[PDB]
Amino acid sequence: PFXCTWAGCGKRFTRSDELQRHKRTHXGEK
Numbered sequence: 001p002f003x004c005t006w007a008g009c010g011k012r013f014t015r016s017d018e019l020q021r022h023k024r025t026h027x028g029e030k
């Protein structure tokens, strides 16, 4: 799976593109 390895985070998604959806809350430019 694809896991969000963000500081203070750690969520796992079966789609790199829900992963990149979630990564939304951390990211602005990306």
Ligand SMILES: [Zn+2]
Pocket: 004, 005, 006, 009, 010, 011, 022, 023, 026
């Ligand atoms: Zn995250």
